[PDB]
Amino acid sequence: EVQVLVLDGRGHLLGRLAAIVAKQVLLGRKVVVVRCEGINISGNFYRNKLKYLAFLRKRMNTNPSRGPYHFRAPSRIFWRTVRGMLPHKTKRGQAALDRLKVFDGIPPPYDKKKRMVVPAALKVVRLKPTRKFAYLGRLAHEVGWKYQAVTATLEEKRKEKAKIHYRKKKQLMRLRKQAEKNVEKKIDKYTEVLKTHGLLV
Amino acid sequence: SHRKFSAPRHGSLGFLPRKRSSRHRGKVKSFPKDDPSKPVHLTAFLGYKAGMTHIVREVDRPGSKVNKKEVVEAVTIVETPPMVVVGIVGYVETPRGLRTFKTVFAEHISDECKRRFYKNWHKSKKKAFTKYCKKWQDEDGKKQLEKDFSSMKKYCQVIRVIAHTQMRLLPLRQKKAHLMEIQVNGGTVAEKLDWARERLEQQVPVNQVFGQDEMIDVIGVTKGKGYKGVTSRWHTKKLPRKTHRGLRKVACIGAWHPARVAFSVARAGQKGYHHRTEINKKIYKIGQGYLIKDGKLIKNNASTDYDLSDKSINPLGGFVHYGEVTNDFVMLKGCVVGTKKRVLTLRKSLLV
Amino acid sequence: SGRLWSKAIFAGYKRGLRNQREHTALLKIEGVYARDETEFYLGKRCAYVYKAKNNTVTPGGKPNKTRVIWGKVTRAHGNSGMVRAKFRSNLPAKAIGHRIRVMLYPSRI
Amino acid sequence: VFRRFVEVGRVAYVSFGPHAGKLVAIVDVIDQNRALVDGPCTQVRRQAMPFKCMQLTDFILKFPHSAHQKYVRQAWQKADINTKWAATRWAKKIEARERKAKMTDFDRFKVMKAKKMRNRIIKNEVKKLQKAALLKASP
Amino acid sequence: MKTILSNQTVDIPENVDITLKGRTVIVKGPRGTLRRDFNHINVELSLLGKKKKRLRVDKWWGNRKELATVRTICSHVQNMIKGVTLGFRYKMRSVYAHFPINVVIQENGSLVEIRNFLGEKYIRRVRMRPGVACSVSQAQKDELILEGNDIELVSNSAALIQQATTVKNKDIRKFLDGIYVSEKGTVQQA
RNA sequence: ACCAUCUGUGGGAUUAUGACUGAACGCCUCUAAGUCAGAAUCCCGCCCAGGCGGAACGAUACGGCAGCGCCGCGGAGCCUCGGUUGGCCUCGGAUAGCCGGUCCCCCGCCGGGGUCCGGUGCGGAGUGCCCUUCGUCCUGGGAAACGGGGCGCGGCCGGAGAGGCGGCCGCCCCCUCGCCCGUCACGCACCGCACGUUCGUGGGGAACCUGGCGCUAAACCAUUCGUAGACGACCUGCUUC
RNA sequence: ACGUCGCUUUUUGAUCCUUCGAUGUCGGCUCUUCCUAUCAUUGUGAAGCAGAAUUCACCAAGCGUUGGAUUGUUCACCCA
RNA sequence: UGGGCCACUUUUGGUAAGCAGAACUGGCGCUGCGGGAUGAACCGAACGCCGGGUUAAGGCGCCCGAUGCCGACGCUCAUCA
RNA sequence: GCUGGGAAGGCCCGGCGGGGAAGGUGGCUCGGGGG
Ligand SMILES: [K+]
Ligand SMILES: [K+]
Ligand SMILES: [K+]
Ligand SMILES: [K+]
Ligand SMILES: [K+]
Ligand SMILES: [K+]
Ligand SMILES: [K+]
Ligand SMILES: [K+]
Ligand SMILES: [K+]
Ligand SMILES: [Mg+2]
Ligand SMILES: [Mg+2]
Ligand SMILES: [Mg+2]
Ligand SMILES: [Mg+2]
Ligand SMILES: [Mg+2]
Ligand SMILES: [Mg+2]
Ligand SMILES: [Mg+2]
Ligand SMILES: [Mg+2]
Ligand SMILES: [Mg+2]
Ligand SMILES: [Mg+2]
Ligand SMILES: [Mg+2]
Ligand SMILES: [Mg+2]
Ligand SMILES: [Mg+2]
Ligand SMILES: [Mg+2]
Ligand SMILES: [Mg+2]
Ligand SMILES: [Mg+2]
Ligand SMILES: [Mg+2]
Ligand SMILES: [Mg+2]
Ligand SMILES: [Mg+2]
Ligand SMILES: [Mg+2]
Ligand SMILES: [Mg+2]
Ligand SMILES: [Mg+2]
Ligand SMILES: [Mg+2]
DSSP-derived letter for residue B295 is S
CA A86 to chain C, closest CA, distance in angstroms equals 14
C-beta separation of A126 from A16 below 8 A: yes
Cis peptide before B258 (omega within 30 of 0): yes
Would the Cβ of B204 be found within 7 angstroms of any atom in strand F? Answer: no
Alpha carbon distance A194, A197 (integer Å): 5
User: What torsion do the CA atoms of D4, D5, D6, D9 make, to the nearest 10 degrees?
Assistant: -80
The helix (run of H) or strand (run of E) holding residue C87 is strand C82-87
CA B123 vs CA A57, A173, B112, B174: distances in Å: 55, 69, 15, 17
Verify if strand G has an atom below 7 Å from the CB of E174.
yes
Distance from the E163 Cα atom to the nearest Cα atom in chain A, whole angstroms: 26
- What is the distance between the alpha carbons of residues B119 and B193, in angstroms, rounded to a whole number? 32
The CA angle E126-E132-E137, to the nearest 5 degrees, is 80
* Angle between helices A74-83 and A14-26 in degrees, nearest 10: 60
In degrees, to the nearest 5, what angle opens at C-alpha B260 toward C-alphas B259 and B266? 130
CA dihedral C37, C40, C44, C49 (to 10 degrees): -50
A129: chain E residues, CB-CB within 8 Å:
42
Does strand I come within 7 Å of the CB of E4?
no
Helix (H) or strand (E) segment spanning residue A22: helix A14-26
B37: left (phi over 0), alpha (psi -120 to 50) or beta: alpha
Report CA(C55)–C1'(F77) in Å, whole number. 18
Residues 6+ apart with CB under 8 A from B327: B79, B80, B81, B82, B166, B169, B170, B289, B290
Q: Is the CB of E98 under 7 A from strand G?
A: no
Pairwise CA distance, residues E158 & A13, whole Å? 41
Q: Which nucleotides of G are covered by protein (CB under 7 A)?
A: 28-35, 44-47, 49-52, 63-67, 75
Preferred mutation among A180, A195, A196, A200 to probe D, highest tally of D CBs within 10 A = A196
Give CA–CA dist E29/E12, Å, rounded. 10
Neighbours of E136 (CB within 10 A): 16
Compute CA A111 distance to the chain's CA centroid, rounded to the nearest angstrom: 12
Q: How far is Cα B165 from Cα B241, in angstroms, rounded to an integer?
A: 52
Rounded distance from Cα C48 to ligand 2 centre (Å) = 12
Q: How was this structure determined?
A: cryo-EM
Quick one: which of A99, A100, A96 has its CA closest to A78?
Answer: A100
DSSP states along D49-106: EETTSEEEEEEE----TT--HHHHHHHHHTTTHHHHHHHSHHHHHHHHHHHHHT--HH
Return the closest nucleotide (C1') to the Cα of A57.
F42
Q: Give the N- to C-terminal CA distance of chain A in Å, as an integer.
A: 30
Interface test with C, best of A5, A25, A26, A86 (most C CBs within 10 A): A26
Measured to protein CB atoms, the chain H nucleotides within 7 Å are 33-36, 38, 51-53, 61-70, 72-75, 77-79, 81
Enumerate neighbours of B (3 or more CB pairs within 8 A): A
Which of E127, C59, B125, A198 has its CA nearest to residue D114? A198
> Across the interface, do E61 and D1 touch by the CB < 8 Å criterion?
no
Query: Rounded to 10 degrees, what is the CA torsion of A190, A191, A194, A197?
Result: -110
Q: How far is CA B253 from CA B16, B259, C35, in A?
A: 16, 11, 64
| Cβ neighbourhood burial of A46 (10 Å; 0-12, 13-18, 19+) | exposed
Look at residue C16 and give its three-state secondary structure. Answer: coil
Q: How many CB atoms lie within 10 A of CB B171?
A: 16
Shortest-distance nucleotide from D110 CA to C1': F180
Point out the nucleotide closest to B12 (alpha carbon to C1′).
Answer: F48
- Whether C101 contacts chain A with CB within 8 A: no
Listed in sequence order, the residues at least 6 apart from E172 whose beta carbon sits closer than 8 Å to its beta carbon are: none
Whether residues A28 and C30 touch (CB distance < 8 A) is answered with no
Is nucleic acid strand G under 7 Å from E122's C-beta? no
- Count of all residues that appear for chain A in the document: 201
As a rounded value in angstroms, the CA-to-C1' distance for B114 and F212 is 35
Q: Say yes or no for a CB contact (<8 Å) between D111 and A194.
A: yes
d(CA C43, CA C84): 10
Measure the CA–CA gap between E163 and C66, rounded to whole angstroms.
82
DSSP conformation letters of B208-243: GT--TT-EEEEEEEPPP--EE-HHHHT-PPPPPTT-
| Residue B255 alpha carbon to ligand 3 centre in Å | 23
Protein CA at B108 to nucleotide C1' at G7, angstroms: 81
**CB of D82 under 7 A from strand H?**
no
Q: Is the dihedral of CA B148, B154, B160, B163 positive or negative?
A: positive
3-state secondary structure of E180: strand
Task: Using the mean position of ligand 19's atoms as its centre, give its distance from the Cα of residue B261 in Å.
Answer: 16
Q: What are the helix (H) ranges across E39-165? A: 64-85, 151-164
In this complex, do D1 and E2 lie within 8 Å of one another by their Cβ atoms? no
Indicate the helix (H) or strand (E) that contains A164: helix A148-182
Closest CA to B85 of B116, B118, B108: B108
The candidate with the shortest Cα–Cα distance to A134, out of A8, A9, A11, A7, is A11
Q: Is the CB of D66 under 7 A from strand I?
A: yes
In the structure, how far is the CA atom of residue A159 from the C1' atom of nucleotide F4, in angstroms? Answer: 64
For residue B246, the CA-to-ligand 7 centroid distance in Å is 25
User: DSSP characters for A40-88?
Assistant: EEES-HHHHHHHHHHHHH---SS-TTTS-----SHHHHHHHHHHTTTTT
Provide the resolution (angstroms). Answer: 2.2
The answer to whether E152 and E130 have CB atoms below 8 angstroms apart is: no
Identify which of B178, B180, B106 has the alpha carbon closest to the alpha carbon of residue B148: B106
Gap between the Cα atoms of C68 and C47, Å rounded: 6
Amino acid present at E108: N
Closest chain D residue to the Cα of E61, Cα to Cα: D32
Note whether B262 contacts A61, CB cutoff 8 Å.
yes
Amino acid at B249: K
Question: CA B10, C1' G12: Å apart?
Answer: 39
* Pairing between β-strand A100-102 and β-strand A31-34 as defined by DSSP bridges: parallel
Return the nearest residue to F238, CA–C1'. Answer: B122
Phi, psi at E84, each rounded to 5°: -80, -10
At B325, phi and psi to the nearest 5? -90, 120
CB E18 within 8 A of CB E25: yes
Contact of chains A and B by CB distance (3 or more pairs under 8 angstroms) = yes
Q: How far is CA D24 from the centre of its chain?
A: 13
List chains touching A (3+ CB pairs under 8 A). Answer: B, C, D, E
Contact A92 C96 (CB under 8 A): yes
- Considering CB atoms only, which of B95, B258, B263 is closest to A150? B95
Q: If 0-12 CB within 10 Å is exposed, 13-18 middle and 19+ buried, where does residue E107 land? A: exposed
Distance separating alpha carbons of residues E156 and E163, to the nearest angstrom: 10
Rounded CA gap, B271 and B228, in Å?
6
Residue A162 identity (one-letter amino acid)? A
Break chain A down into helix, strand, coil percent, rounded to 5: 55, 10, 35
In contact, A140 and A187? CB cutoff 8 Å: no
3-state SS class at B348:
strand
Is A95 within 8 Å of A22 (Cβ atoms)? no
Which residue does chain A place closest to C93, by CA atoms?
A92
How many C-beta neighbours within 10 Å does residue A201 have? Answer: 12
Residue B263: closest C-alpha in chain A: A63
B85, HSE (Cβ side, Cα atoms, 13 Å): 23
Nearest CA in chain A to C9: A27
Cβ-contact E182, E92 below 8 angstroms: yes
Phi, psi (deg, nearest 5) at residue B197 = -65, -40
- The DSSP string of E128-178 is PPTT-EEEE-SSSTTEEEEEES-HHHHHHHHHHHHHHS---SS-TTT---E
Q: Kindly report the number of other CB atoms within 10 A of residue C38's CB atom.
A: 21
Q: Among C15, C8, C25, C30, which residue's Cα sits nearest to residue C88? A: C25
CA distance A24 to chain C (A): 9
Q: CA–C1' span, E157 to F115, in Å?
A: 41
Put simply, whether A119 touches C (Cβ < 8 Å) is: no
Rg (CA), chain D: 23
In this structure, how many other beta carbons lie within 10 angstroms of the beta carbon of residue B265? 16
